[PDB]
């Protein structure tokens, strides 16, 4: 997360870290939507150009109070996966359209103060919350600064990072780039004349974009961090996978 601040303890009990088994390394973010189900981004597992295609044998998922720079053992659960379901119509080729994947844990996890699922939007919840200007929240353990060249200095969060970012109107999203955006994605972030900054960066993808409902006091995952051109560049916005659009595929998979 670029231009974010340290997350308070317990701020995001649905946060999940997708790791590489050996050598261990953070590959992306994820969210916990049930005690067996984990939501993340398809590119985090399958991106053919980079000969990328992980199996449940080369991945692990960490859940709970990690407050990074340590294996929080007691407040953190490491889990193996059972299966991965990558949306059938995922398009790695052009714009990473339908960038969604489901990870089914090997075993149901024991919830706690630090482990707890987030809600999936519903017809009306989406209806009231998804408007331009309304602010969502991104969380991750990725780089604090665009490591294009290398930017090896800093960029290593010892505590989870939060950034609340506004939803940007569709036509602005589209005119910000020469890439084709489908109704399967939305963009979010600050416009140049707004002064504030913030974006997700390398290592944050797959993670949650959530919004709190004033009608019930609940947090709903509205999007998944998918892509953007660079991190926190002026005139550019981060792109998210529209969880509600593909809410139906997530249902067919668990039924």
């Amino acid at each position: 997360i670029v231009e974010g601040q340290d997350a308070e303890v317990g701020l995001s009990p649905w946060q999940v870290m997708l790791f590489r088994k050996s050598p261990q390394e953070l590959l992306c973010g994820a969210s916990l939507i049930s005690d067996r189900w984990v939501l993340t981004a398809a590119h985090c597992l399958l991106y053919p150009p980079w000969d990328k295609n992980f199996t449940v044998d080369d991945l692990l998922v960490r859940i709970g109070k990690h407050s990074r720079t340590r294996y929080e053992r007691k407040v953190e659960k490491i889990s193996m996966l059972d299966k991965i379901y990558i949306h059938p119509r995922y398009n790695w080729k052009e714009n990473l359209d339908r960038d969604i994947a489901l990870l089914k844990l090997k075993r149901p996890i024991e919830l706690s103060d630090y482990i707890h699922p987030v809600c999936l939007p519903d017809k009306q919840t989406a209806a009231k919350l998804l408007h331009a200007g309304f602010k969502g929240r991104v969380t991750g353990w990725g780089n604090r600064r665009e490591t294009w060249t290398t930017s090896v200095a800093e960029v290593q969060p010892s505590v989870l990072q939060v950034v609340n970012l506004p939803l940007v109107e569709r036509p602005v999203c589209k005119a910000s780039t020469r890439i084709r955006i489908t109704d399967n994605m939305f963009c979010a972030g600050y416009k140049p004349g707004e002064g504030k900054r913030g974006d997700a960066c390398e290592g944050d993808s797959g993670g949650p974009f959530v919004m709190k409902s004033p009608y019930n006091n609940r947090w709903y995952q509205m999007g998944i961090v998918s892509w953007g051109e660079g991190c926190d560049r002026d005139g550019k916005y981060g792109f998210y996978t529209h969880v509600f659009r593909l809410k139906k595929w997530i249902q067919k998979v668990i039924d």
Partner: peptide, 29 residues
Amino acid sequence: EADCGLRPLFEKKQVQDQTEKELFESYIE
């Protein structure tokens, strides 16, 4: 599912996090 999105350390405790009001403000704006 069910009791989703209510955090054990905030919602369940009637405690609002540090950056929460910023989101609400964006709503009623």
